[PDB]
């Protein structure tokens, strides 16, 4: 359509003004005296927020000039919430800080690219600074802590991710979901559990837990359907004549083969238990295989060319117990060889290594955890659904930052480690002046995170940075007692990815910014 | 959209504004000099509704940032409206208060978040009050006292739903329809009844009645459509040689067959009534073995690979007697063994405290209600539908105040039990002086339902409330008589489960809404 | 009510303690507290209240059966 051009400082006012816009609303809820912001849903009740990501998405300035601004910061938001959960409002208030003083060194006559460089220089200098001050996380003691500071100073939340972590193991997979009641709860899972039921009721021996229980059984792995007993005949002879219980899998059962299993059952032959093949397509195919490797069995197929017809009992794998529900099936202990667990566990990881979807790269998580560890399910507890939404909030960002802490290590929090790298970094200088603002720019920007937690706090946040810097190592501020001391011992510990996203990502979109001569936009 | 954003106290006053006109609405209906609020409906006649959860739900705002207020503040009403039918009015009524205090406590400069912690704590130690002050009602004086007050002080409402409850049993359900006369009526059914008719009226062996009624019959349960008599023969020459009368339940029921049974009875060799199974899928199934342990037969099934060819009359269940309308089927009295039906209650009612969908947990509490115990439905008396509509309203809230009352007990009426709650609490303080005051801002708020009973009378509140609180235990003001006295022995009387309902959604809610700081809303 | 008001106590309370109260017992406004009010010294004439209910009463009678009003066009 009709295009209207604005160029130089009249381009750079609107687009600042958009940026400080988007970047006020996120700035509200920094720290822990943060306030929540408010965002309407057209249809449904309001949402209560305090993390900045949803904030920032929400927000879409009327103004075509400023919404071009706030668009652009908009993205260290999502982008800081996609590679490492939290930081979305640490990595804005940082973009807002780089782009008003970078904006002013423009004014100043600055080349915009040099600033660019010299920012970028700083960047990656405080990125390896920022390697050196992070000490590892790995006991409970810091995991409970980074999990309390991320879900805003909630004890309960951090505890239960650290005792979750301790159960589930690295390998095992820790969710968050709806909880039933007002008190939160954990349940964690290990052994090969997955989300498919018994076939008919008929087959409960348990009616008083609802359910079939079958100890010792064998278990049988098929390819496609059932179609008849005629196919089943001398598998059942040879299981029934053995004696012990029987699971099958399969991609689905026949009414005939239903029929006549419910029959042996119930009148006493043979005792079996049958349920359904979880997902769909290749996916299916490969837990499967799994699921054979856990039992120690024979995956029964087509493609190998073997008849349902010419199986034997030596081509069934085997399990201490199963238990099977009308929603959930769930195998105890199999007697396959570890060293053959641990091969197709290998095999399973390393394709993790190349998963450019992130979807399915955590559903290849599931099954390294199935096979080995456990998945746990953290129920979040609230009266009301509002109170619900923002309860899981908090304790998805509580996961999403230990999972860091184990992975990176920790730093002191409250934006000390910024402040602390950044006077590491004074004499880092550049090949031209204007290098060398850009890298003072920067230098700068690093002390906004901590003032911008101290003024939410109410208190002046330029007297808290001058005695935070005068301080040496972890002497920082606690926001929520408001007293000084050293970060570490006082818990407030956040992971050195976070911190480190937040800072490249901001500088990313902020040098950007700062070299634009021209806007472009649709007429209004 | 564009998003207009507003910050800081414009944002909390606008937010105020649109709580203050939802509160308003519902406030008029409190206690019993409470008047009643008329609700247009686009299509057919306006809805006088004295219910606060129907208010809420029909008010929508015009004012963007008013509405997003007045949204929030409908989940009260709402939550719980689901959790417990009445309250709904208390639980708006306090959240009003606690929003308005809190606010006052938010512009004092007190943390919102600090504020929050305290009321949770002051809801939390307040419940746990209630539960203490909670005195059992089992007694029929207390149930038909609890459904007076329900209904507005309609005392035959009260009587109607504590015989029905007598009668029914703890296992039966109480249930309300519009009824056919000015008189409201109570029609209790024990015994398996269900909503089919007689197949044919060539059966009615009752014509004065317009009906069928068979004395000691045998009872045939089968799976699938009757096709045939081909399939039928040698239960029919077993049960006409036996000598007795005989009901058929089947899914359906084939031409030839239907045809071939009237032929049988009409001209006198088999007395015979044939039935339609009830509802659809699993739970017909479920339901027609259920019948089978009442009758104490069996269910002659595909799935267990019983012929309908191979029964035999050991394979019958059997009743006292049997009756069927063109609607309607009823069984009186069956040959199934206790024990064996207590097994199958208990395994169903098992599967109540399974029940994810409320919806099918009423439906699972009817069956349980049906093989032991009782369903009545009251019909609701009313010269115009629009009567109809309130005095139906009125008849429900009291069926949800009775049952809460059996399940939690009760305390004293009108808010003399928050009144005494806030007294016990009084030294109960907080980590830091903002948790201390939000303490002091729920103590206050427990105050409100109180005041706003009397000020809707014409009382000043105020003088009222300090006559209360100066009194101890159940000394209380009745609102009708507008006389002092013990509350209990006055009889009014709500249950433990709608105060202490009403009192944790409204602390949620308000306790978000307090600790907003920014608003983002679609531009106007 | 009012003076209790604008003093910023609760005028329902206040006038209720007046209220229940005997003879002069009475809420002092500026010391905040309530005494008999011939010895606290608040004291004023008889036909300075007789004279403002019997003056307010006819506005009032005049206002309520008044039926027109003629006044100049704007
Ligand atoms: N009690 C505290 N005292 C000082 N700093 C804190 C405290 N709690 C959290 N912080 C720090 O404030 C920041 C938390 O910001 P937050 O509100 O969680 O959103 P985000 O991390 O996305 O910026 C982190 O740097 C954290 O270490
Ligand atoms: N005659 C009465 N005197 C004093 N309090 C009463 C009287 N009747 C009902 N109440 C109390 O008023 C409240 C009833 O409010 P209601 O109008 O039924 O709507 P809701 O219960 O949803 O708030 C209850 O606390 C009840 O105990
Ligand atoms: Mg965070
Ligand atoms: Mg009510």
């Given amino acids: 359509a009709a295009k209207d051009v604005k160029f130089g400082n009249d381009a750079r006012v609107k687009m600042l003004r958009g940026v400080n816009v988007l970047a006020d609303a996120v700035k509200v809820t920094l720290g822990p005296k943060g306030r929540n912001v408010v965002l309407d849903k057209s249809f449904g009740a309001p949402t209560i927020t305090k993390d900045g990501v949803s904030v920032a998405r929400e927000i879409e300035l009327e103004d075509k000039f400023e919404n071009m601004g706030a668009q652009m910061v908009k993205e260290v938001a999502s982008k ?32 915009p690219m040099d600033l660019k460089r010299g920012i970028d220089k700083a960047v990656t200098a405080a990125v390896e600074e920022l390697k050196a001050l992070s000490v590892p996380c790995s006991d409970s003691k810091a995991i409970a802590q980074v999990g309390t500071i991320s ?23 820790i969710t968050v979901e709806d909880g039933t ?10 052994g090969m559990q997955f989300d498919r039921g018994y076939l008919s009721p008929y087959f409960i021996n348990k009616p008083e837990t609802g359910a079939v229980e079958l100890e010792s059984p064998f278990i049988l792995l098929a390819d496609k359907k059932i179609s008849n007993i005629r196919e089943m005949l001398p598998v059942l ?25 419910v029959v042996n059952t119930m009148r006493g032959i043979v005792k079996v238990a049958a349920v359904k093949a979880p997902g769909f397509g290749d996916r299916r195919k490969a837990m499967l295989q799994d699921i054979a490797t856990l039992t120690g069995g024979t995956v029964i197929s087509e493609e190998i060319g073997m008849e349902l017809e010419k199986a034997t009992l030596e081509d069934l794998g085997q399990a201490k117990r199963v238990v099977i529900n009308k929603d959930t099936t769930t195998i105890i202990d199999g007697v396959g060889e570890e060293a053959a667990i641990q091969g197709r566990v290998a095999q399973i990881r390393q394709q993790i290594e190349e998963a450019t979807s992130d ?31 923002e309860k899981k909030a908090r304790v998805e960002d509580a996961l999403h930052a230990t999972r860091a802490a184990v992975e990176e290590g920790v730093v002191a929090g409250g934006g000390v ?16 002046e204007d290098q060398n603002v850009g890298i003072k720019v920067a230098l700068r920007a690093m002390e906004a995170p901590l003032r911008q937690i101290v003024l939410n706090c109410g208190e002046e946040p330029s007297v808290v940075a001058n005695t935070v810097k005068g301080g040496d190592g972890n002497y920082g501020y606690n926001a929520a007692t408001e007293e000084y001391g050293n970060m570490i011992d006082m818990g407030i510990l956040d992971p050195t990815k976070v911190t480190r996203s937040a800072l490249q990502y901001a500088a990313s979109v902020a040098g950007l910014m700062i070299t634009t001569e021209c806007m472009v936009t649709d007429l209004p």
Avoid: F
Avoid at 181 to 190: A, P, S, T, Y
Avoid at 237 to 261: H, S, Y
Avoid at 364 to 388: D, F, H, N, P, S
Avoid at 417 to 432: E, F, M, P, T, Y
């Fill in 359 to 389: 979807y399915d790269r955590e559903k290849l998580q599931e099954r390294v955890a199935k096979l080995a560890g456990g998945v746990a399910v953290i129920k979040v507890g609230a009266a009301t659904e509002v109170e619900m939404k």
């Fill in 237 to 261: 002879e040879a299981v029934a004549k053995a004696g012990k219980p029987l699971l099958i899998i399969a991609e689905d059962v026949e009414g005939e083969a239903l029929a006549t299993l």
């Fill in 417 to 432: 480690a910024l402040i602390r790298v950044a006077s590491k970094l004074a004499d880092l200088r550049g090949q031209n």
């Fill in 181 to 190: 009641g007002l008190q939160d709860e954990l349940d964690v899972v290990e």
């Fill in 80 to 111: 800081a919430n996609d590679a490492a959960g939290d930081g979305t409002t640490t990595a804005t208030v940082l973009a807002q800080a780089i782009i008003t003083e970078g904006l002013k060194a423009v004014a100043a006559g600055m080349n």
């Fill in 151 to 173: 879900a805003n100073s909630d004890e309960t939340v951090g505890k239960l991710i650290a005792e979750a972590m301790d159960k589930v193991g690295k390998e095992g997979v």
